[PDB]
Amino acid sequence: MQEQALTELDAEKKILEQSRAGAQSRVDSYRALYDENVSAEEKRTMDL
Amino acid sequence: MQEQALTELDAEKKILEQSRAGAQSRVDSYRALYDENVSAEEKRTMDL
Amino acid sequence: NFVDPTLRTGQTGMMNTMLEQLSQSELNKDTLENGFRQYLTAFEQVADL
Amino acid sequence: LAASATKITADNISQSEAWRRRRQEWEIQKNNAESEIRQIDAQLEALA
Numbered sequence: 001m002q003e004q005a006l007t008e009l010d011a012e013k014k015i016l017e018q019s020r021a022g023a024q025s026r027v028d029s030y031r032a033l034y035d036e037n038v039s040a041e042e043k044r045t046m047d048l
Numbered sequence: 049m050q051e052q053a054l055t056e057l058d059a060e061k062k063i064l065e066q067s068r069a070g071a072q073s074r075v076d077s078y079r080a081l082y083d084e085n086v087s088a089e090e091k092r093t094m095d096l
Numbered sequence: 097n098f099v100d101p102t103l104r105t106g107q108t109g110m111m112n113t114m115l116e117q118l119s120q121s122e123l124n125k126d127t128l129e130n131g132f133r134q135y136l137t138a139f140e141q142v143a144d145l
Numbered sequence: 146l147a148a149s150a151t152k153i154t155a156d157n158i159s160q161s162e163a164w165r166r167r168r169q170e171w172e173i174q175k176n177n178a179e180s181e182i183r184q185i186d187a188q189l190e191a192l193a
Contacts, residue, residue, distance in 0.1 A: 011191035018187050022180030029173045039165070040102070041119050041158050048116065048155030057192065064189050071181045078175035086164050091122040094157055116154050121161040 110138040 038046075086094075102115055114135040118128070 008191060011187065014187040015184060015191055018180060018184040022177065022184065025176050025180060026173065029169075029176065033169065039162055042162050044116070044119055045155045045159045045162070048151050048158070061189065061192055064185060064192060068182065068185045068189065071178050071185055074178035075175060075182055078171055078178055082168060082171040082175050085168055086121060086161075090164060091124075094120045094122045094161055095127060116151075116158075119154075119158045119161075121165060 108142075110135055110142070113138070 104111075114131050117131045117134070120127070
């Protein structure tokens, strides 16, 4: 039963790794948004 | 009492399955939104 | 590496107004041809001078 | 009339850009829910 109690931790690690991957995808998305501050076309609107 | 401790897990699975179904409904909704990028009528507005 | 096909120095007003009209998201053949016919009208006028 | 039509085409570009930012928010939400599904599946595996 100790081996089962110890593969349960290898399962908890998978849960936390999916959390990590979700949060990393969010950081990747918002960094792109915040870095491309205004689109090439939002500047075109202001010039217009 | 072990059998009760073991049907409690069949109850935890139901909790997690409702979570799974909620999240799957959200994915289904947002995929439809993101796939139908602009409606047939939002394009009509731009042509107008 | 730095040439941007859309923004160019010395770009004529004709090309400016065409890029203006292609700056939406729905570029179907109808808008893509109307823009070019209008560009071509302006071009014809500046070529007849 | 040229000034009016210039403001009209500026509003057109602004509209389409608002819709593009909307679709980007939607893609972020779809990825949130899509990763939450993976997390809940890993959670169901930990429960099994």
